[PDB]
Amino acid sequence: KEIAITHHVKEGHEKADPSQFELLKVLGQGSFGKVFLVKKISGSDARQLYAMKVLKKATLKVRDRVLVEVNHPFIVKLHYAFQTEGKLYLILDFLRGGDLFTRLSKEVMFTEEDVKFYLAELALALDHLHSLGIIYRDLKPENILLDEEGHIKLTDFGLSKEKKAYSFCGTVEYMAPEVVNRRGHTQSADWWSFGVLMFEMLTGTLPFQGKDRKETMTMILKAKLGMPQFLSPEAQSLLRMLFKRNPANRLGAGPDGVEEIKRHSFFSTIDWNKLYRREIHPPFKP
Numbered sequence: 001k002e003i004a005i006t007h008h009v010k011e012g013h014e015k016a017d018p019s020q021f022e023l024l025k026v027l028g029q030g031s032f033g034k035v036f037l038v039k040k041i042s043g044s045d046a047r048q049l050y051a052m053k054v055l056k057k058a059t060l061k062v063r064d065r066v067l068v069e070v071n072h073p074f075i076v077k078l079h080y081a082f083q084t085e086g087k088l089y090l091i092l093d094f095l096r097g098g099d100l101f102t103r104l105s106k107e108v109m110f111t112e113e114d115v116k117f118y119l120a121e122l123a124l125a126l127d128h129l130h131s132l133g134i135i136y137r138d139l140k141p142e143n144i145l146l147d148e149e150g151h152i153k154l155t156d157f158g159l160s161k162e163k164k165a166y167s168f169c170g171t172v173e174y175m176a177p178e179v180v181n182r183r184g185h186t187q188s189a190d191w192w193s194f195g196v197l198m199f200e201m202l203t204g205t206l207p208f209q210g211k212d213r214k215e216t217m218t219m220i221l222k223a224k225l226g227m228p229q230f231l232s233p234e235a236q237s238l239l240r241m242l243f244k245r246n247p248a249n250r251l252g253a254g255p256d257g258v259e260e261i262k263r264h265s266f267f268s269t270i271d272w273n274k275l276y277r278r279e280i281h282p283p284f285k286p
């Protein structure tokens with residue numbers, strides 16, 4: 001019922017305040033609502049243009065991550081997040097004409113061909129965040145945006161809808177077993193969530209889902225997955241390899257990380273260089 005934003009800050013982070021920004025424009029951006037276009041006044045990113053959101057009733061959680069940063073084609077970043085007079089200010093990559101991946105998934109039926117495109121961009125994005133020291137934990141469709149051209153933009157910040165408060169409050173359906181049991185986890189937990197995203201894109205349903213959180217948790221830990229037989233052998237194989245309960249056995253967990261996924265037969269048709277250059281067209285345009 002309330003928005004919680006999670007900001008994964010870098011080591012050299014420079015705290016910001018309202019005074020460090022010049023207001024340029026006020027835009028109405030559909031799903032994004034009222035967006036201020038602002039210009040950074042000082043610091044290393046002086047003169048950079050950003051989107052600013054001002055949230056009336058939101059909580060902010062700031063976390064540490066595990067070179068000057070450059071843009072990645074498939075990520076939007078939260079640059080600054082600060083609270084002033086009961087308000088939360090978010091300074092974000094400007095994403096004009098952007099929209100929600102969830103809006104798309106509700107409107108379309110994804111085929112395996114469609115999903116290969118979206119998951120390939122998402123894999124590049126997720127691996128990049130890992131290289132930056134960000135572990136997602138409960139990567140989910142709410143984290144996935146689309147630019148005006150229809151390409152994936154994964155948010156580098158957490159966003160959820162949140163009795164006692166918790167430092168981490170994730171959506172259980174997307175959580176790996178080792179995350180559910182709070183025994184310790186790594187970037188490999190995110191490849192499980194990646195598999196959950198893939199499963200949901202392909203079937204319109206979640207692979208582990210009970211009546212309550214408690215039941216869903218037990219299913220994630222112990223439930224055998226009923227693999228939909230309409231899926232190709234390649235799709236089936238990828239999902240089985242992502243849904244290994246022991247993270248050590250999970251695809252993407254070895255030293256080569258995301259390469260294990262890029263080399264999987266499910267993605268055999270993807271040219272990863274062309275993809276990164278944004279030279280492959282999306283299945284759906286917003």
Ligand SMILES: C[C@@H]1O[C@@H](Oc2c(-c3ccc(O)c(O)c3)oc3cc(O)cc(O)c3c2=O)[C@H](O)[C@H](O)[C@H]1O
Binds near residue numbers: 032033155
């Ligand atoms: C923090 C979010 O800001 C606004 O949406 C934006 C989002 C966003 C992200 C995840 C979601 O699940 C979602 O529903 C929206 O992301 C943005 C990213 C940017 O780089 C720039 C933006 O202006 C927004 C941007 O304006 C919306 O007002 C949304 O209600 C609010 O929760």
Ligand SMILES: [Mg+2]
Binds near residue numbers: 016079
């Ligand atoms: Mg800040």
